Design a protein around this ligand. Structure first.
Ligand code: CA
Length: 490
């Protein structure tokens, strides 16, 4: 008997949750048992641990003809809505308004999150995983090279050009050869992001080549004339050797390869993992210092950080039509948005993974010092999982190094991160058009982008034929769909 109990009579419900192509809900998790006793609702997992693909598992369940009481997982937003509109998942609007104080309070302060999870009919069919902290990537530069060469931190695009050229020509690594590669990136798509330096967008969100909104109008970065002008500049820098000539092929281990071999001078990547190269290289390469840099003022007079975390994520859980206890269930869901529920779902269980010190959750030293990443230690006990929960950045701050936090706090403070596109939820008919043409158009745009950057094709001479292919491949039909959907949802 707890003050937090959502029912006096103990309840057991079946949950089908498969995620990250490897994990499932485990009723034996310390976090699951804690929530169970605090709410009086226990969840039993019915998902398959042998599965290689989470989406396939959801499909088999939906097709089986039978349904559990709750369904959760990653990348299920579109399925929650499609099946929600067919009655498989119940709408949560009224249940929340009447039984979930924590959620309605949350939604009042986060109206954009509610808008992002709303289906074409106005119903909420699931609760999302809501990450905390918008800052994701940022620019990093070799401070030791700026120092060796007596250069000031570049404040504008042209000043940055001057710096990268010095890195290229003035032998900062001191081996007497011009082996330096000024800008490197493990993600080829980041070369497209450089058009930001000339006031052009490359994507509306963390998803590569995504649409963005400007004054209520949907636009795609790669179809804009501004992209044409901007990619010419990126192409010029590539021609001059300022960008890794292998930018489209090096990939995954680019940072290890280039910074490791002491030839990389700058990148744009996630603060935490990038800042850790200092730990690895501080001694190996005497004087090595890779540090966060504010984005330079672009050709339109603005400092842009186009990337940010997707908030909310297209992950979460929903209540099925077969669930005989919808009210008790929504109250369970609500528990996760209140203080205790939020603490547990973020940090684990007191005495096992953390302790409450002066009213605040602090990870145990063995947790912070373990070889296994904190994220994985949390998944192991039922925390940081893709159910409907409200992430707390404090948990991540506790395992992010100082160089990273110094840069993150600078980006937050100076407001460089641009407003993100949280996406639109489509109707079945709109989806059919999107799925038929978009995949191929996206592929084509990338191939064209690469050709222009590498100087294989000329943006000026091929722009019209490019736009013709866009029309022919259905780009504008997709654009019609997106705008209708945007107007309806926002
Ligand atoms: Ca050199």
């Amino acid at each position: 008997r707890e003050a937090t109990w959502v029912t006096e009579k103990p309840l057991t419900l079946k949950i089908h949750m498969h995620f990250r192509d490897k994990w499932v809900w485990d009723e034996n998790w310390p976090v699951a048992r804690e929530v169970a006793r605090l709410t009086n609702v226990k969840l039993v997992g019915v998902a398959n641990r042998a599965a290689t693909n989470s989406q396939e598992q959801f499909n088999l369940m939906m097709a089986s003809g039978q349904l559990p009481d709750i369904v959760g997982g990653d990348n299920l937003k579109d399925k929650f809505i499609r099946y929600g509109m067919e009655g498989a998942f119940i709408p949560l609007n009224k249940l929340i308004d009447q039984n979930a104080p924590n959620l309605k309070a949350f939604f009042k302060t986060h109206p954009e999150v509610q808008r992002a999870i709303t289906a074409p009919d106005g119903n909420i069919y699931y609760l999302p995983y809501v990450p905390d902290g918008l800052v994701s990537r940022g620019y990093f530069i070799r401070q030791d090279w700026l120092d060796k060469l007596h250069l000031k931190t570049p404040q504008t695009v042209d000043e940055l050009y001057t710096v990268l050229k010095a890195f290229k020509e003035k032998d900062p690594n001191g081996n007497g050869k011009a082996d330096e590669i000024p800008f490197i990136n493990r993600d080829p798509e980041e070369v497209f992001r450089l058009v930001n330096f000339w006031g052009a967008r490359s994507t509306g969100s963390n998803t590569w080549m995504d649409f963005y909104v400007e004054n209520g109008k949907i636009k795609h970065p790669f179809a804009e004339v501004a992209f044409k002008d901007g990619i010419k500049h990126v192409a010029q820098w590539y021609k001059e050797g300022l960008i890794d000539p292998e930018i489209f092929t090096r990939k995954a281990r680019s940072r290890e390869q280039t910074f490791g071999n002491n030839i990389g001078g700058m990148t744009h990547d996630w603060f935490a993992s990038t800042a850790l190269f200092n730990d690895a290289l501080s001694k190996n390469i005497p004087g090595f210092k890779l540090v966060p840099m504010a984005p330079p003022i672009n050709s339109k007079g603005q400092r842009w950080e186009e990337d940010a975390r997707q908030i909310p994520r297209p992950d979460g859980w929903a209540i099925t039509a077969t669930n005989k206890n919808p009210v008790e269930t929504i109250k369970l869901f609500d528990f996760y948005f209140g203080p205790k529920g939020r603490e547990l779902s973020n940090f684990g269980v007191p005495g096992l993974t953390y302790d409450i010190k002066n009213g605040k959750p602090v990870y145990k030293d063995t947790v912070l010092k373990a070889a296994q990443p904190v994220n994985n230690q949390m998944y192991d006990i039922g925390a940081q999982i893709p159910i409907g929960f409200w992430q707390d950045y404090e948990y991540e701050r506790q395992w992010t190094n100082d160089v990273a936090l110094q840069g993150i706090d600078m980006y937050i403070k100076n407001k460089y991160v641009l407003p993100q596109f949280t996406g639109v939820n489509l109707t079945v008919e709109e989806r059919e058009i999107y799925d038929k043409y978009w995949p191929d158009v996206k592929t084509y745009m990338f191939e064209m982008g690469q050709s222009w950057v590498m100087g294989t094709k000329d943006p000026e001479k091929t722009w019209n034929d490019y736009q013709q292919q866009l029309k022919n491949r259905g780009f504008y039909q997709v654009m019609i769909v997106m705008q209708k959907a945007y107007d309806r949802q926002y």
